[PDB]
Amino acid sequence: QEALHNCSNEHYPVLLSLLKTSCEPYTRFIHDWVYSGVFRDAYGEFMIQVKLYWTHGYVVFLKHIAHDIYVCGKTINLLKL
Amino acid sequence: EHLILVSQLEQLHRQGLLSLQKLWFYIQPAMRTMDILASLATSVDKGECLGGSTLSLLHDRSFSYTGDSQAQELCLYLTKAASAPYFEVLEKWIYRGIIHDPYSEFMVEEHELRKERIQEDYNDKYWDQRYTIVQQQIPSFLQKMADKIL
């Protein structure tokens, strides 16, 4: 949110460089469970986690795709069987 | 191989260039390996697992880690290395009615039912308690062929 708050100043590149490296582990997380069906997280600080196979738990960012990833990983974990 | 890696770090510390941060960076891929093998060793230690009971566990452990594949080669080869005498004993039972079963960790166990029903197969004793199964000595992926093997 502090990104969109300030973009028209000289403090634009400092915040951009900080957010660009602060968002790398999250982008690393989403790059695994979609393509390999294995999730990763640090301390359980990201909420999203994971017969009939849909008896699995689940507990800004672009929330249009966040819930979509949650099913898009479980189907890979099913096709790995 | 772990001794090989720390011999490299012996050279690099001798050369006046090793720092604590550099070695902390270096030892993490080995840290993953030793963590995997310590967890596996603890798990097989506590349950007194041997035979097919420690062959189901490596079937599951070969399944479990598949997201980096740094450890998948490890458990797949360790699965083959532990399954090597068991496949020979199986292949022996498959091609040839003789078995020699050197230590009792095989799925099929042979106890004589010839001493009860002598010089007759008028009991169908082979299909009875002569050549029987052990339940927990199947490695849990030959379970679906289990009747046909016997």
XYZ file of C-alpha atoms in Angstrom:
231
model
C 0.000 0.000 0.000
C 2.892 2.415 0.607
C 3.810 1.815 -3.046
C 0.559 3.200 -4.445
C 0.602 5.909 -1.776
C 3.832 7.502 -3.091
C 4.908 7.246 -6.730
C 5.247 10.898 -7.693
C 8.225 11.757 -5.468
C 11.955 11.060 -5.116
C 11.204 8.263 -2.633
C 9.750 6.174 -5.490
C 12.972 4.101 -6.168
C 13.770 3.306 -2.525
C 10.291 1.895 -1.907
C 10.355 0.121 -5.278
C 13.672 -1.592 -4.521
C 12.422 -2.577 -1.086
C 9.113 -4.033 -2.291
C 10.756 -5.796 -5.230
C 12.980 -7.850 -2.930
C 10.381 -8.103 -0.166
C 7.917 -9.786 -2.546
C 10.363 -12.441 -3.792
C 9.534 -15.229 -1.246
C 5.803 -14.944 -1.948
C 6.429 -15.119 -5.709
C 8.709 -18.074 -4.990
C 5.852 -19.751 -3.094
C 3.311 -19.338 -5.884
C 5.820 -20.584 -8.488
C 6.029 -24.036 -6.831
C 2.517 -25.261 -5.921
C 1.111 -24.389 -9.368
C 3.906 -26.028 -11.360
C 4.970 -28.818 -8.991
C 2.059 -29.108 -6.554
C 4.240 -28.659 -3.464
C 3.579 -25.686 -1.210
C 6.182 -23.814 0.814
C 5.880 -21.204 3.558
C 8.093 -19.737 6.252
C 6.258 -19.656 9.575
C 2.635 -20.161 8.585
C 2.364 -16.375 8.261
C 0.669 -16.762 4.881
C -2.852 -18.033 5.506
C -3.243 -20.302 2.465
C -2.352 -23.955 3.001
C -3.580 -27.446 2.179
C -11.338 -40.716 -0.298
C -12.851 -37.626 -1.933
C -9.674 -35.512 -1.595
C -11.402 -32.200 -0.770
C -11.179 -32.562 2.992
C -8.117 -30.327 3.179
C -7.627 -27.200 5.264
C -7.045 -23.667 4.036
C -5.876 -21.709 7.098
C -2.771 -6.132 -0.526
C -2.314 -8.945 -2.987
C -4.266 -9.591 -6.156
C -7.103 -11.565 -4.575
C -8.653 -12.230 -8.007
C -6.103 -15.047 -8.433
C -5.279 -15.986 -4.802
C -8.243 -18.316 -4.246
C -7.753 -19.679 -7.789
C -4.229 -20.808 -6.828
C -5.694 -22.719 -3.860
C -7.569 -25.111 -6.139
C -4.846 -24.963 -8.848
C -2.368 -26.576 -6.461
C -4.633 -29.309 -5.112
C -5.374 -30.564 -8.626
C -1.633 -30.887 -9.326
C -1.270 -32.791 -6.051
C -4.054 -35.068 -7.289
C -2.517 -35.586 -10.740
C 0.825 -36.456 -9.125
C -0.847 -39.637 -7.833
C 31.122 -37.427 0.893
C 30.442 -35.173 3.899
C 34.087 -35.630 4.907
C 35.029 -34.667 1.326
C 33.045 -31.419 1.634
C 34.589 -30.465 4.967
C 38.041 -31.266 3.544
C 37.324 -28.617 0.915
C 36.423 -26.183 3.675
C 39.676 -27.150 5.448
C 41.595 -25.954 2.385
C 39.518 -22.811 2.105
C 40.006 -21.913 5.777
C 43.745 -22.593 5.406
C 43.925 -20.061 2.578
C 42.995 -17.070 4.779
C 39.678 -16.419 3.039
C 36.917 -18.248 4.925
C 34.375 -16.272 6.921
C 31.532 -17.529 9.106
C 28.863 -16.231 6.710
C 30.486 -17.980 3.741
C 30.628 -21.347 5.518
C 27.066 -20.808 6.772
C 26.096 -20.442 3.126
C 28.122 -23.522 2.187
C 26.774 -26.033 4.721
C 23.033 -25.671 4.019
C 22.736 -28.240 1.127
C 24.455 -30.774 3.368
C 22.238 -29.628 6.255
C 19.158 -30.701 4.297
C 20.716 -34.124 3.603
C 21.734 -34.777 7.201
C 18.310 -33.580 8.399
C 16.551 -36.065 6.075
C 18.744 -38.949 7.164
C 18.477 -38.098 10.874
C 14.665 -38.002 10.607
C 14.631 -41.305 8.700
C 17.053 -42.882 11.193
C 14.975 -41.737 14.186
C 11.780 -43.103 12.620
C 13.239 -46.521 11.816
C 14.965 -46.599 15.203
C 11.915 -46.047 17.383
C 9.651 -48.697 15.855
C 12.283 -51.492 15.670
C 11.596 -51.649 11.943
C 13.262 -54.274 9.781
C 12.342 -56.135 6.634
C 9.282 -54.930 4.788
C 8.297 -52.636 7.633
C 11.292 -50.425 6.801
C 10.555 -50.847 3.098
C 7.042 -49.392 3.303
C 8.511 -46.449 5.206
C 10.987 -45.655 2.443
C 8.182 -46.068 -0.106
C 6.312 -43.310 1.743
C 9.468 -41.237 2.319
C 10.252 -41.460 -1.402
C 6.773 -40.070 -2.009
C 6.951 -37.275 0.580
C 9.739 -34.982 -0.694
C 9.267 -34.026 -4.343
C 9.326 -30.224 -4.438
C 13.058 -29.561 -4.801
C 14.285 -33.016 -6.000
C 17.557 -32.412 -4.134
C 16.405 -35.173 -1.776
C 14.303 -37.245 -4.199
C 17.359 -38.893 -5.821
C 18.521 -39.768 -2.310
C 15.414 -41.638 -1.180
C 14.812 -43.262 -4.576
C 18.282 -44.802 -4.619
C 17.995 -45.678 -0.933
C 14.725 -47.434 -1.750
C 16.440 -49.492 -4.449
C 19.439 -50.242 -2.213
C 17.226 -51.483 0.608
C 14.921 -53.375 -1.780
C 17.781 -55.223 -3.516
C 17.897 -58.440 -1.371
C 14.109 -58.478 -1.069
C 13.679 -58.484 -4.856
C 16.085 -61.419 -5.094
C 14.140 -63.418 -2.495
C 10.896 -62.491 -4.298
C 12.245 -63.480 -7.728
C 13.387 -66.733 -6.153
C 9.844 -67.436 -4.900
C 8.403 -66.358 -8.270
C 10.359 -68.516 -10.697
C 11.038 -71.522 -8.451
C 9.176 -73.309 -5.600
C 12.462 -73.298 -3.614
C 13.240 -70.460 -1.210
C 16.028 -70.219 1.333
C 14.752 -67.166 3.335
C 17.943 -66.369 5.305
C 16.357 -63.960 7.813
C 12.645 -63.831 8.619
C 11.598 -60.556 7.084
C 9.816 -61.808 3.960
C 6.108 -61.692 3.195
C 5.804 -65.452 2.672
C 6.574 -67.693 5.615
C 6.846 -71.464 5.347
C 5.952 -73.604 8.346
C 5.379 -77.291 7.709
C 1.843 -78.654 7.513
C 3.299 -81.882 6.149
C 3.864 -83.165 9.701
C 0.095 -82.988 10.312
C -1.198 -84.189 6.926
C 1.539 -86.620 5.881
C 1.915 -88.038 2.303
C -1.380 -86.491 1.230
C -2.689 -83.262 -0.213
C -6.139 -84.351 0.987
C -6.348 -81.250 3.189
C -5.323 -78.736 0.488
C -2.624 -77.967 3.045
C -0.641 -75.633 0.764
C -3.606 -73.248 0.535
C -3.887 -73.715 4.323
C -1.411 -72.708 7.051
C 1.678 -74.155 5.338
C 2.690 -71.293 3.036
C 1.136 -68.277 4.713
C 1.468 -64.502 4.697
C 2.999 -62.108 7.183
C 0.851 -58.952 7.299
C 3.338 -56.233 8.226
C 6.291 -57.523 6.181
C 4.823 -56.477 2.822
C 6.445 -53.215 1.590
C 2.945 -51.762 0.829
C 3.290 -51.412 -2.921
C 3.391 -55.143 -3.704
C 0.140 -55.344 -1.714
C -2.028 -55.176 -4.829
C -0.276 -58.241 -6.342
C -0.136 -60.031 -2.962
C -2.353 -63.062 -3.612
C -0.868 -63.747 -7.049
C 2.703 -63.715 -5.673
C 1.871 -66.392 -3.091
